[PDB]
Every structure is written in C-alpha cells, then in structure tokens.
Ligand binder design. Structure first.
Ligand SMILES: NC(=O)c1ccc[n+]([C@@H]2O[C@H](COP(=O)([O-])OP(=O)(O)OC[C@H]3O[C@@H](n4cnc5c(N)ncnc54)[C@H](OP(=O)(O)O)[C@@H]3O)[C@@H](O)[C@H]2O)c1
Ligand SMILES: NC(=O)C1C=CCN([C@@H]2O[C@H](COP(=O)(O)OP(=O)(O)OC[C@H]3O[C@@H](n4cnc5c(N)ncnc54)[C@H](O)[C@@H]3O)[C@@H](O)[C@H]2O)C1
Ligand SMILES: NC(=O)C1C=CCN([C@@H]2O[C@H](COP(=O)(O)OP(=O)(O)OC[C@H]3O[C@@H](n4cnc5c(N)ncnc54)[C@H](O)[C@@H]3O)[C@@H](O)[C@H]2O)C1
Lengths: 380, 174, 380
C-alpha cells in the first residue's frame, strides 16, 4: 500500500504533511512512502533526510500522486477552477487526509466525489480526550499562540521586559490576550516568558485557573453567565449582545493601558465574535499593536484584513494569514504526527491494508466523502 | 577589622526585623542564587516581614541583569523598585540584604572626590539598621576600589557563595 | 540659551534625541528647547507632548537649528560630500552632541571644524560606572541585543522554547552569540528566557563568567591568549590569524548545530572581525539564520549586506541597519536622558549659561573638535 505526500502549492504555505520520524513509523506499519522533490524545504526537512528515513523521492507532483493509495496533505487540493488541478493528480478511489476546509469549500468536496476519493477532513476531529493527539487545529493553534507574541514584539517599537538602566527604567509591556484557548494559553506563556505583564479574559469558567497558574491575571466579567458558557465539546457558545456590553466595559479599563492585544477567540461554525470595536481601538495608545488570529474567520477586530497590517488610529492591526506556516518547521512534524496518530489504529498487522472503522467516532466525525457520495451530517 | 558572620547569625538578624530591602548585584548572577533569594523572600513574608528589591541602574554586567534573573525566579514586579523610588526607604529598613553587590553601594561615589566612581548615585544601604554583605572574599567589584561599608559596626560580612549562603540562611530560618 | 533637536533625516532612522521628560528638565536648567516638527513621530512622541512639556515646534530643520546654541542629534550630520548638507544648518560656534562615528568618519569632523562647531562624539564615552548615566552605546546596544533575538525568532521557522504536546515534542531553538558585550549579553538573556539553548563566545577573559551568569554556555578556544585580549578601556584588541583559525575550528562544532547565530563583535576604529566565514555559512543546517549587528562596520559574517536580508547557501543572513531604531519608542527617551546627563553638570544654574569642565574625562575623552581645531588625539 503506497502513501504519498506532495509539496504545498498554495501561496504562503511552507508546511508539509510528513517528517523523517513519521516516515520510519509508516515503513514500520508496511507502507511504501513517497514524497515530492523539495516538499519539506519550507519546513527545513530535506530530501536527503526523508530518504534516510526510508522514503522514495519523486521528481514531480503527478508522479508522486499517480499510484498513491492514501494521500497526506496539509491544505485542501486545488482544482482546475483555481488554476492548478491537484484533485486530478490523486488516484481514483484513493483516500485523502488533510485540512480540507469542508464546511467552507464545497467545490473541492464535490470535485473529490467525482473521482470517488474518500476524503477525511482533519479540522473536524471530534473534541474527545483520546483524539487530542490527532487534532490538527490544536497542534497548529498552539504554535500560532507563541507566534502571535513574536509578531507582536516585531511590530512593537518598545521592549517587552522590565529593565532598570542608567538611562532610565524601561517598563514592561502590558499584554492582553482575548480568548484563552490552546493559542491563548501559549500566548500568555510566551508573553510571560519575554517579561510582559499579562492580562487575559474568556467566557469559560475553567480558564481562570489556567491563566492564574501561568502568572496571568484574569479579567472577570460575570461569573453567573460564564458558568453556563461551555458546551459539551469544551468550547464557547453565543453570549448575546448584553454580555458583550458588560465585557467591553470591564476590558476597556485594561485595554487603554495595553500595549499588545492578542485576540484568539473562535465560536466553531459561527463567525468570530467582535471583541475589540473601532471605538475601542481609538481609546488605545498610539504605537500599540493588535494581533488578530481570528482574521480568517471574520476577525475579533473588524479593522483587521487577511494577509495585511492595517495602521489606523495610531494602532497596528496585524492579521497574517496561515499563522502556523510562520512556524513551519515545528508545525510540519506535529501535523505529520497528527495524521499518523489518526491513521495507525486502522492499519492491519498481517493484512497490509487500511480498515477505517465506522463504529469509531474519530472516522465518522472526520469523513466528508466516501466513494462518490457526501456522507457527513453537516453538508447533507 | 571586619565583623564576619555565619548563616545562623544572618538568620536571627532578619527573623527579628519588620522591613528588609534586598539589594542584588553581579555576584547573585554568577552564583545563580535567584530562586533561593526569592524563596528566602517568601519565608520572610510568611511571618509578616515587609520585603522589597532595590535594583541599581548599573547592577550586574548589562542593563537589566538583575531584572531578567529575578523574573526567572518569579518575584512579583510590584516588589521590584528603581533607585529613585526606594532610596528613601533605607532609613526605615531594619536590614539591607546586599546579595553579591558592591560598587552599587559604595559611598566613595559621594564622599571621596579622588574615587573613580565619584558622582554616580548609589543605594544608601548604610542608612539601614544592619547591612548584610554576601560575597566570597574581600575582593573589590568591577571598579577596582575598596568599600568602607565593610569596616563598620552596623555591617556584617557573610563570606561564601551567594547561592549556598542564601540556602544556608533559609535552612537556619524555619 | 537655545537648544535644538532636528528630525533624523537618514533613511530607516526613526529615533530622536529628545523626550517630553527631558524637555522640561532642560527648561528647568534654563534652556529654550526647540524641536523640528514631526521629529518624534517614529518614536511615538507627538508635537503636542513636546509642546506641553515646554518646547517650541519649528516648521523646518533650518529654522530649528539656525539660532541654536546647542544641537542634540542621534546620527551624524549629513555632509555635502554625501549631497545634502546638514552641518551647514548648524550655527557657528554652536555645540553639537551625537553619535559622530568620528574614528571611521573624519570628513564630518573636518566639515564641523570649518564652521567652528564644537562637536562631542558620544561613542567615545569612557566605559566606566559613573559615565553610564551618559552612555549612548550602552542604552542603544542593550536594545539592539534584545532586538536581534526578536528578529531571529521572527525569521526562524521553529519556536524558541521546547514544547511537549499531545501530538509530540519539538526541540528548543539553539542560539549562538558571537561577541558578549552589552548587546551580546541582552541577546543571551532574551534568548534564554524564551526557552532556547544558548551558547556564546568572546575574546575577553571576563566574558566566560558573564555568559555563565545568565545560564549560557561559554565556548572556550584558547584561555592562554584571552588574558591579554582586553584593552585598558574594556574593548577587544585585534586578535591575529593564529587565534582566528583556532576560534573558527573551536566554534564549528556548535555552529553546525546552531539555528540562530547572533553576531555583535566590534573593534573601535577598525573593521569588524570576520567570525563566520563563507565556508562556515555552507556548513550550517538549512533554515538557519544569522543576525549581523556588526553589518554597519563591514559585518562579522561578511556575506551580510546593510539594510538587506540575503539568503546564501540556504542560510538567511540578516543585516538590518539602525537596529535600535527598531525599538525607537524606548530607544529615543533613553538616548535623550544620556545627552541630558552628559550636559547637566556643565550648566550654570545662576547665569543660565553652558561652561564645560574641560579637564573632565567624560568631556576630554568625547570632544572631537572645538572653535575650529580638531582636539582629539585619535584624529591627529
Ligand atoms: N550593567 C552594566 O551595563 C555593566 C556592565 C559592565 C560593568 N558594570 C559595572 O559593574 C559593577 C556592578 O555593580 P555590582 O554591585 O552589581 O557588582 P560588583 O560591584 O562588581 O560586585 C560584585 C560582587 O559580587 C561578588 N561575587 C562574585 N561572584 C560571587 C559568587 N559566586 N558568590 C557570592 N558573591 C560573588 C564579588 O565579590 P567576591 O569576589 O569576593 O565574591 C563582588 O564584590 C559597577 O561598577 C558597574 O559600573 C555594569
Ligand atoms: N480533543 C480535545 O480534547 C480538545 C481539542 C482542542 C481543544 N480542546 C479544549 O477546548 C478548549 C478551547 O480550545 P480551542 O483552542 O479549540 O478554542 P477555540 O479555538 O474554539 O477558541 C478560543 C477561545 O476563545 C474563547 N471565546 C470564544 N468567544 C469568546 C468571547 N466572546 N469572549 C471571550 N472569549 C471567547 C473560547 O472560550 C475559547 O477558549 C480548551 O480548554 C482546550 O483544551 C480540547
Ligand atoms: N562600567 C560599566 O558600567 C560598563 C557599561 C557597559 C559596558 N562596559 C564595558 O565596555 C566594554 C565594551 O563593551 P561593548 O558592548 O561596546 O563591546 P563592543 O560593542 O566593542 O564589542 C562587542 C563584543 O565583541 C567582542 N569581540 C571583539 N572582537 C571579537 C572577536 N574577534 N571574537 C569574538 N569576540 C570579539 C568584544 O570582546 C566585545 O565584548 C566591555 O568591556 C564592557 O564590559 C562597562
């Protein structure tokens, strides 16, 4: 059974869905591992490194994907309509595993049905304990949280840590993270590493203990409503307009003092909640920075634009696209392990084939298309 | 005539004190005595003692040498103070706990025209009740000059490594 | 008595030699403070903040510096030999205080001499405890050393700290700091606190303990030689090929494992020493980055180019100019404080006139020309 990892052809994508460690394990499972020439260059994984692990280097993309029974990829394959027909290169009746973007990109899903490809949308991994090692959103957003601080410090024209100097005391930068998810917790940790005073806020009640254990200080808003705000899958729900007004006023007291604002808040399925308005950024100090990690899902700030740095009211609003690709060389080996952890339980020991189990909710929650028909409860 | 002292001596001095101003310098960094110093600060605070840190602008071998190392040890920022904020408090301080610092405290800056460090503002540790200097020997600091504060009856020398000596003081306390 | 501060005209330079705090101090000493409009815009200092502090805003550079008994500036003035003539705007018999680069730029001194301008080259400040209140090298290098790590982390495709996640573990970034002065030491501190494994090396014997005082590992090459490496003023001597060969050999073992090499080594007057050869660049792993803070003095890695990030042998060699200007909002008030502390002891409180202590080591050591004669022994 052949497995193939191509190079990511989309603009700005430097990650790859393989690493030398993961190659060895696949070979151990009985796979024949093919990788496209120069695929890991952006993630600093050479061709020589992959061959040493025990893989074949195909020269072109087409040759890599021609005979491949299973295809591992980072982002969704491009179509003819997008000026590069990557879907055609995948073998008929094969199995795709990637960040498919299924709920926003139907044209690729229905293009994959036409070739009867059984695609597994890794972004839809169910929120269950045992699937933590298989979850690409979680592994990648963790690195994005770290990266938000580095971009913040790179755009900010003052230092982060407190330093008593003979030219004067340099004061610590005051960071405020909005949304203490996987990304938020790493942003706190990294900001606190660089010596910043760190504030944070979130709707879920359990995060207050997590902020405090990292040396952060939590901005409480309304303990009654925050108790009911967590869903079954352990994420936020719609808080309505009346909570937002109470939240904004409590936030403003610290936001006016804040130097770096890192917004990471997401509501799965729904658009991203507006946590910093245009009237709120006018009240901030000129020279401050806003990092909007939710920019591609509507933005927690409405002034943010995808792939751009908007300067307005003296404040830089940063909104880079594909933030985990900015940490490509750590993103890739963990993304590859997410795919490996997902796939390994379904491989036969002495059959040498892949048996994706319908009873297993990791498979049913992930599966968008199977053999020429859309199967997922969302979509159809 | 230096009044030398042990860890048990420094334990009694600060156990029976109301206010203590910690003065860290280059020697603390060399010994890497930050976590023991902050642990010592916790046991003082545990029994109601007022603790604060006094960071001299040129303390260490780089701007903000003490600040990064104290942040590593998780001292609260609201206990850390610049020279101009805290210098007044030495009058009301029972103890100036000088850990691996020297030129930072040297009154040859103010009293001695012929000194090379003359004119630099210093931390007025001498105005405290008892001045505790932790250092391995009678060797001078970077400027290469003697400190007259070593030779007076309100001062105790605590000869040893700054990590080991601070750990020994914490064990002498309870 | 009138003191004047212009906007920095050189490209990239966003700093300014003034702050609101230092304006009112100068006014208290009795000066009339003049400043060019928009001089502090890059350093987050509005004209209203300078006006509120007590300064006069002037429409142009010529109008601010016409009249102007003292001139404070950051970079050296543009000579006519570089086209635009800034020294022509300065009053005859005025006092100039800035970074002149006097040892490498004698023409600007000759130009300043031709208008009888008394010029104090602030980079020739003696490196002693008492002069630190007035040391522009120390305050600016410290921020430049901090910046190198932020810029290294920005250009580098992995995260600094080790991370132990559910998807797996990624190692820390490995940093090597060449030259452990003020900048080098703050780079170690900032890299170490971000979670990187930090190596370092230098010629001066005092360094080894200084590196170890920040939890870094010193790379020794020849301790019998480092004894004589330090001059009377604390600077490094020219070292010779015998040592240089042995350094490159000794540092090679760590440099092959290094992700981020931050090079800061300088020698007063002379071109910067080659610490990373072209052959050494070829042997570093792909995805590595070099930050060359010595780029403006020819570079420690001489493949670096001023104002440019160049990729050579798969290694991203960074060479930003005016690195403290990347932290312009903290850098500027520290620079203004240095110039205040230099000047304050020479001001007459009663008569409101400037009378310099000529025998003062601060003044004699830094003075380059006075009343149309080049005084400093280095330039005779
Ligand atoms: N901040 C900067 O930018 C910078 C840069 C360069 C120089 N400086 C200069 O350095 C000085 C800084 O003042 P400071 O008070 O911090 O340092 P200092 O005056 O040089 O004194 C350091 C003291 O620590 C002691 N020490 C060293 N290692 C020790 C150890 N492992 N355990 C216990 N004690 C140890 C030394 O005495 P023993 O040897 O007897 O133990 C020494 O007396 C100033 O003169 C300043 O101008 C500052
Ligand atoms: N399989 C598994 O077990 C998990 C996989 C991923 C995440 N898992 C857990 O879910 C939560 C949230 O993590 P995630 O990073 O997935 O959250 P999101 O990316 O959806 O959104 C980021 C945070 O943003 C918060 N949020 C969302 N909306 C708001 C508003 N309006 N104000 C303030 N904060 C808000 C929300 O509570 C989230 O914590 C955290 O405890 C994780 O350990 C668990
Ligand atoms: N008294 C005080 O408070 C001081 C405050 C700041 C600095 N002080 C002293 O000034 C001097 C010069 O410091 P700076 O940061 O200006 O050094 P440079 O910028 O000239 O150069 C950076 C480093 O580069 C090193 N260097 C220079 N050449 C080399 C070579 N060839 N290999 C390796 N390293 C080299 C050199 O030893 C320096 O440590 C040093 O002894 C400091 O302890 C003292």
């Amino acid at each position: 059974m052949k497995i193939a990892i191509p190079k990511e052809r989309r603009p700005g994508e430097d990650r790859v869905a393989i690493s030398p460690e993961v190659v060895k394990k696949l070979v151990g499972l009985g796979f024949e591992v093919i990788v496209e020439q120069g695929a890991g260059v952006g993630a600093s994984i050479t061709d020589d490194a992959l061959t040493a692990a025990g893989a074949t280097i195909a020269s072109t993309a087409a040759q890599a994907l021609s005979q491949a029974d299973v295809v591992w990829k980072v982002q969704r394959p491009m179509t003819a309509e997008e000026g590069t027909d990557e879907v055609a290169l995948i073998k008929e009746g094969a199995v795709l595993m990637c960040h498919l973007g299924a709920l926003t990109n139907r044209p690729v899903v229905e293009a994959l049905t036409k070739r009867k490809i059984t695609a597994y949308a890794m972004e839809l991994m169910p929120r269950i304990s045992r699937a933590q090692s298989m979850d690409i959103l979680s592994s990648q957003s963790n690195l994005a949280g770290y990266r938000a601080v580095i971009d913040g410090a790179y755009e900010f024209a003052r230092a982060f840590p407190m330093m008593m100097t003979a030219a004067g005391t340099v004061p610590p930068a005051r960071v405020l993270v909005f949304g203490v998810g996987v990304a938020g917790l790493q942003a706190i940790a990294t900001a606190k590493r660089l010596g910043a005073v760190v504030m944070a806020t979130d709707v879920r009640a359990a995060t207050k203990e997590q902020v405090e254990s990292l040396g952060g200080k939590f901005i409480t808003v309304d303990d009654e409503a925050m108790k009911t705000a967590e869903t079954a899958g352990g994420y936020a729900k719609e808080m309505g307009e009346e909570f937002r007004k109470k939240q904004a006023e409590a936030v403003l007291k610290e936001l006016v003092k804040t130097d770096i604002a890192i917004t990471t808040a997401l509501i799965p399925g729904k658009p991203a909640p507006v946590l910093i308005t245009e009237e709120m950024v006018t009240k901030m100090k000129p020279g401050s920075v806003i990092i909007d990690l939710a920019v591609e899902a509507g933005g927690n700030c409405p002034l943010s634009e995808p792939g751009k740095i908007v300067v307005k009211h003296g404040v830089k609003i940063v909104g880079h696209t594909n933030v985990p690709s900015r940490v490509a060389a750590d993103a890739s080996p963990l993304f590859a392990k997410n795919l490996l952890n997902f796939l390994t339980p379904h491989v036969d020991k002495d059959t040498k084939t892949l048996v994706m189990k319908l009873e297993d909710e990791t498979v049913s929650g992930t599966c968008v298309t199977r053999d020429g028909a859309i199967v997922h409860p969302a979509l159809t | 005539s230096v009044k030398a002292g042990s860890a048990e001596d420094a334990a009694f001095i600060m156990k029976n004190a109301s206010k203590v101003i910690i003065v860290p310098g280059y020697g603390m960094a060399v010994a890497q005595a930050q976590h023991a110093l902050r642990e010592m600060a916790d046991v003082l605070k545990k029994e109601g003692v007022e603790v604060s840190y006094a960071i001299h602008p040129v303390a260490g071998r780089m701007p903000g040498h003490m600040n990064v190392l104290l942040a590593e040890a998780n001292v609260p920022y609201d206990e850390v103070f610049e020279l101009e904020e805290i210098n007044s408090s030495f009058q009301t301080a029972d103890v100036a706990f000088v850990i691996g610092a020297n030129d930072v405290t040297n009154p040859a800056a103010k009293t001695d025209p012929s000194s090379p460090i003359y004119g630099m503002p210093i931390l007025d540790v001498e105005k405290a009740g008892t001045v505790l200097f932790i250092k391995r020997s009678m060797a001078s600091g970077y400027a290469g000059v003697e400190n007259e504060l070593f030779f007076r009856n309100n001062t105790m020398m605590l000869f040893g490594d700054a990590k080991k000596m601070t750990e020994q003081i914490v064990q002498a306390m309870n």
